[PDB]
Swiss-Prot record:
One GO term (biological process): regulation of cytoskeleton organization
Gene Ontology CC entries for this record: axon; caveola; centrosome; cytoplasm; cytoskeleton; cytosol; dendrite cytoplasm; early endosome
Keywords from the named record: Acetylation, Apoptosis, ATP-binding, Cell cycle, Cell junction, Cytoplasm, Cytoskeleton, Kinase, Membrane, Nucleotide-binding, Nucleus, Phosphoprotein, Serine/threonine-protein kinase, Transferase, Ubl conjugation
Family, per entry: Belongs to the protein kinase superfamily. CMGC Ser/Thr protein kinase family. MAP kinase subfamily.
Span(s) of short sequence motif TXY: 178-180
Enzyme class: transferase
Family annotation (Pfam families): Pkinase
InterPro entries, sorted: Kinase-like_dom_sf (IPR011009), MAP_kinase (IPR050117), MAP_kinase_CS (IPR003527), MAPK_ERK1/2 (IPR008349), Prot_kinase_dom (IPR000719), Protein_kinase_ATP_BS (IPR017441), Ser/Thr_kinase_AS (IPR008271)
GO molecular function, one term: phosphatase binding
Record protein name field: Mitogen-activated protein kinase 1
Free-text note on domains in this protein's UniProt record: The TXY motif contains the threonine and tyrosine residues whose phosphorylation activates the MAP kinases.
Upper lineage: Eukaryota, Metazoa, Chordata, Craniata, Vertebrata
Modified residues (Phosphothreonine): 178, 183
EC number: 2.7.11.24
Length: 353
């Protein structure tokens, strides 16, 4: 319009550079639109974020911005531009511009039965991108089909780092990590048992849930709640071995698991009779109840199922991994607004340097 462009009666003030707005859904803190970038001459995705009234919204917005701003990887969504008011008082919204991806795995699996070549290629990309995330000491914490973007030529990109976080190995996090992380159906066992002291292996589990879903077009553990989710897991994996119950540091947690009826391990080839044998082996290694025995991203890439893509020299790691200085963000929302104002300044029109 004359002033800011509107969409659904809402202001979507993306200056003159981005035009031809089209609503494409809801983000956690605002709607998302696709627009035509008049400079780059392509359509992009722009998400409006209004987190300033809440502390956790600000903490999560700052995190995604700082993480994605340092990350440079083919299998990870990047930030192309950031639009916001010239002065901090005027800043109520922040617009993050990213590549417009044709679809995502959640939407694809909804209408498509994947060929083994596609499953293999998609798994390789998730892991190649996950290796990088992990080498930077970052935990994504919300890996799932909808968070795996896809373009018209099978390129996959991991997105939505709002629930992501830095965890420097140099420090002990046991008891300080946020508790209710990840989407339920893709939540590793330990997020319930060892609630505040989990690790980056929770991402490998999530990837395992995505592999299983890619093979059957159905979520492997569609739990209805926190406990049922656990039973869904043990109904297929079977009751935990003795050395696993023991590795569960929480007393009451370990007690609950023990006071549960016995269940046999449902063989993988019973659930996926059609699936490739190697895929089922790697799957087995990814959906391991014990986080210490679970396969790691570098080993998962080296597994035989991905042997035709595996190439450690073309699977890069973070040049500059994140440290503890990145975990000093449990600040007041006022301070966080200042940090978000500073991080985005470099995208301001005319910014020198």
């Amino acid at each position: 319009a004359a002033g800011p462009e509107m969409v659904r009666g809402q202001v979507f003030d993306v200056g003159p550079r981005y035009t031809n707005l089209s609503y494409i859904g809801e983000g956690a803190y605002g709607m998302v639109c696709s627009a035509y970038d008049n400079l780059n001459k392509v359509r992009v995705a722009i998400k409006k974020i209004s987190p300033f009234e809440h502390q956790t919204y600000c903490q999560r917005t700052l995190r995604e911005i700082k993480i994605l701003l340092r990350f440079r990887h083919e299998n990870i969504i990047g930030i192309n531009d950031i639009i916001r008011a010239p002065t901090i008082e005027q800043m109520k919204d922040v617009y993050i511009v990213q590549d417009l991806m044709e679809t995502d795995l959640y939407k694809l699996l909804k209408t498509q039965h994947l060929s083994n070549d596609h499953i293999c290629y998609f798994l390789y990309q998730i892991l190649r991108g996950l290796k990088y995330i992990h080498s930077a000491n970052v935990l994504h914490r919300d890996l799932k089909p909808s968070n795996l973007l896809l373009n018209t030529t099978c390129d996959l990109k991991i997105c939505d780092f709002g629930l992501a976080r830095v965890a420097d190995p140099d420090h002990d996090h046991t008891g300080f990590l946020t508790e209710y992380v990840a989407t339920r159906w893709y939540r590793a066992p330990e997020i319930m048992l060892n609630s505040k002291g989990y690790t980056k292996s929770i991402d490998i589990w999530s990837v395992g849930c995505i592999l299983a879903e890619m093979l059957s077009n159905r979520p492997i553990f569609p739990g209805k709640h926190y406990l049922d989710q656990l039973n869904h897991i043990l109904g297929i994996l079977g009751s935990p071995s003795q050395e696993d119950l023991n590795c569960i540091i929480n007393l009451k947690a370990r007690n609950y698991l023990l006071s549960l009826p016995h269940k046999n391990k449902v063989p993988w080839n019973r659930l996926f009779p059609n699936a490739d044998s190697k895929a089922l082996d790697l799957l087995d290694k990814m959906l391991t109840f014990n986080p210490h025995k679970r396969i790691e991203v570098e080993q998962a890439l080296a597994h035989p199922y991905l042997e035709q893509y595996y190439d450690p020299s073309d699977e890069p790691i973070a040049e500059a991994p994140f440290k503890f200085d990145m975990e000093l963000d449990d600040l007041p929302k006022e301070k966080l607004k200042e940090l978000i104002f500073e991080e985005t300044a470099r995208f301001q029109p005319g910014y020198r340097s």
